[PDB]
Structures are given as C-alpha cells and as structure tokens.
Write a protein that binds this ligand. Structure first.
Ligand SMILES: [Ca+2]
Ligand SMILES: [Ca+2]
Ligand code: NA
Ligand code: NA
Ligand code: NA
Ligand code: NA
Lengths: 250, 250
C-alpha cells in the first residue's frame, strides 16, 4: 500500500500576495499526514511560501532544478538554493519543459542525479504526445523516458522518486485521460520498473496522474489500483479545488 | 557621451545570507548616480536583495526571463514576477544559456520583445566562441546575433537595450580580451546598429564588455571609446572587487 501523493504545480502564475495566500490556505486545510502534499510555486516566491507552510504537513517544491550544484550557469537554480528556501521536491521533465522549452533526456538524467545527490526528492514527469498516442507509440515512449531518466540510479535513490504520468494531450486542454486510460499507462510504467529494477521498487514507487485533473474527476482516477495520487495543474491555483483533490486521495 | 553601465552577474552562486550581505555592501558603496549599477542574483533571492538595495541607486536584475507573460510554462519566471521582486533589468542570451543550456535565436528574440513589452529593460548578451574566432567568423556571428535578437524592435524600444559583448573564450577562463580586442568587437557591433538602425541608436546604446573582468584590467577596458562599462562575472561576488570596477567606470 503506497502512501498517496498530491502535488500542486502552480506553473508561471501568482503574484507574491497570491502565493502567500494560496500557500497559507492549503497549509491550514491539511490537517493530517495521511497523504503526502506538496506545492510548487515559481522560484521567486519559494522563501515566502515556505514561510506560510511552516507548522503544517505540506511540503514545498520547485518547478525545475539545475543539473549542476553550483557555479557558472547563468539563470539556473541549484539544489542547494532550493533546499535553503525549504524545498523537499523538484519537478523534473515536465512536458512544458520537454516539448516547449526543449529539455533532452541527457539533461533530465543529469538533473535527476544532481537533485538526488544534493538531498532533494524528485518528481519525474513523463508521458506521450497526441501524435505518439495516435500511432500507438506510447509504450516505446514510456520505456525510453523512464529508463533514460533513471539510468545509473541506485536502488536506494529510488526511495526518493515519484513518477508523474501526464499525457501531453491532457495538459491544459480539458481533455482528461479516462480513469481506465490513466490506469493502463500507470500499470505499464510500473511494469517497466519491475522488469528492470525489481518488485520492491515497482511496488513502492508512487506513480501519480497529471493532466486536466479537477475535483469532479479525481475520485475515479484515485480509485485505480496503480494510480497513487495526482500532479495538479490549473486546479492547484485555488485552495479549495486543490484541497478537494487532496481529501479525495485520503 | 553614453552613461556607463556596470552589471554584476552572480550566476548560480550565493546563499540567502551571502546574497543579502553582498547586495547591502554594494548598495552602501554606490554613493552617486554617475554610473548605472545593477546586480543580478539568482531568482530565489530577488525579493531579499531588492530589499537591501532600497534607498540606493543600485538596480536589481534577473539572470534570465520567460518569453511568455503568464501561464502554463512550468519552471519559467515571467516579466511580471521579476518586476514585482523589484527588477529593472533582465539578462537575455548569456553565453552559458546559449551554448550550455541551448537557447535559440528564436527564443532569444521572443524574450527580448516580451521583456520590453512588459516593462523591463534588457541586457542582450552576445559574442563568439574560440572556434568561431579562430576561423575569423566573429563578424558573421555578431551580425547574426544582433540582427536576430533585435528583429522587430521599434526605435523607441532600443532606449531600454544594453548590449553585452562577452567572448566565450573569455568567460571563466582568466583569459580576458585585450582592451584593443574588446574595442574592435564593440566598434563592429556599434557599426551594425548604425547601418541598420541609424546614428541615434548606434551612438546612444551602451555596449559593455564581459569576460574575465577584474579590478586589475578594468581601467584599460574602460578607456576604450566604444566600451561603455562591464558585465562582471566572478568579480561581482565580492563587494570590494565589484565596487572597484564601478568606481573605475566613473
Ligand atoms: Ca526485488
Ligand atoms: Ca538616425
Ligand atoms: Na544539456
Ligand atoms: Na502539471
Ligand atoms: Na523556443
Ligand atoms: Na557574466
């Protein structure tokens, strides 16, 4: 039985005041530790949101992280910086970064190692595009993404890995995967872990669903055997809709 | 006579305490407004450094900025966010982002427009690699970089542009361009502005030198007719070395 995991990806949204308010409202609403809950503000607000999360079970996370630990990497944010702001997690490989910004598997694999080595936990994002789906390539893509990102990880390092399945066709489109479609993808990802990394790792690693998650569809998704929670996009920007999803994971 | 411009690029360095201390020490040392001075902390420390710069002439800047104004761009930081932290400037096209991260001219051109439209001023970084230099391609590169980044800018928008020439061979290598080499590059860049954008823009736009600038070499660089200041890397991490360069631009 995997502890459920509900993460709120605020993306490139919120003013400083809105960030503080959203963080504080989510913190106040998370009144037990039965579900792992984390929120992911944009970099400039991390120390401010970290402050309002103090005294609550809610973790702080960053939306990206450098592949390097320090130094001459203009514009990049290091694991050390994120840890100092209060982060426990970093998202790596989000579809917007893979497909719009253009991050490679080499870069993603380096980020995973660097984040873990420095003491962060990692939410590794993966998933297929509409074009890939329509050509039945989703299993090829899932295998490439999972095995490339995890290349070189120790068994122990997997203890700090969460995988987020986000079909790209489901992001910001209002077209959620049916729970049955989500379940099929999660089951395949778990099988890929099992065949290469073994039963303990496959059965212990949370695989969470991302993509057009809303309070109206979360129950069906949450009930699926290989779905361990949610990576929430737009619905994470309102505290009540985010908390509704958290409470559904309980 | 162009007002000189001295910018401190802290890159992926400093703890929160160190950032506050460095900002405060630079602020205290800048006791007139004869030189435009700006410091560029990593994103998470921007509000903290903005605070310690209050009441001084020193401006705040960011090391990068999104090409988009808001929304579903995980990991990206918007002009609106930067402005709220107190930023007046954003660096765009730094060599580490062009060559290590992999930012394209399309992305850079979009960033320049987006930053300017939202109210930021822009430090556009450009410059050639060792391979390009050795093959005498530097003028081809300078033209491509300047004309691609500025494509579509209005004459009025140029009022908020600074160009930084950083030869890539000079970054972090301890091999500064001789002042005469810097001057040749700056003169060529200014000619490219003149031939396409006219005399007013060419003669008014600050072109600053970046790359292994140190208090020991700044005077020779500062004296060159087409050098209008410095984009300072490693030397910006100590307040006294940074201030020495600021005072030399006076
Ligand atoms: Ca096993
Ligand atoms: Ca003219
Ligand atoms: Na890379
Ligand atoms: Na998301
Ligand atoms: Na792009
Ligand atoms: Na620099």
């Amino acid at each position: 039985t995997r502890k459920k995991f509900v993460a709120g990806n605020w993306k490139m949204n919120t003013t400083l005041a809105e960030a503080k308010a959203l963080g504080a409202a989510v913190a106040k609403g998370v009144t037990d530790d039965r579900v792992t809950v984390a929120v992911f503000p944009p970099y400039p607000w991390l120390t401010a949101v970290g402050e309002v999360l103090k005294g609550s079970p809610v973790a702080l996370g960053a939306q990206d992280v450098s592949s390097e630990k320090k130094g001459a990497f203009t514009g990049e944010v290091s694991p050390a910086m994120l840890l100092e702001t209060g982060c426990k997690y970093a998202l790596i490989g989000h579809s917007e970064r893979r497909h719009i910004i253009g991050e490679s598997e080499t870069f993603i694999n380096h980020k995973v190692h660097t984040a873990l080595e420095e003491g962060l936990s990692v939410v590794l994002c993966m998933g297929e595009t509409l074009a890939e789906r329509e050509r039945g390539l989703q299993e090829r893509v899932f295998q490439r993404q999972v095995y490339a990102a995890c290349a070189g990880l120790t068994d122990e390092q997997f203890g700090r890995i969460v995988i987020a399945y986000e079909p790209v066709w489901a992001i910001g489109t209002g077209k959620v995967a049916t729970p049955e479609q989500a379940q099929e993808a999660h089951a395949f990802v778990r099988s890929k872990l099992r065949l290469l990394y073994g039963d303990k790792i496959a059965d212990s690693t949370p695989i969470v669903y991302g993509g057009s998650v809303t309070p109206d569809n979360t129950v069906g998704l949450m009930s699926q055997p290989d779905v361990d929670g949610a990576l929430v996009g737009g619905a994470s920007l309102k505290a009540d809709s985010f908390l509704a999803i958290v409470k559904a994971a309980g």
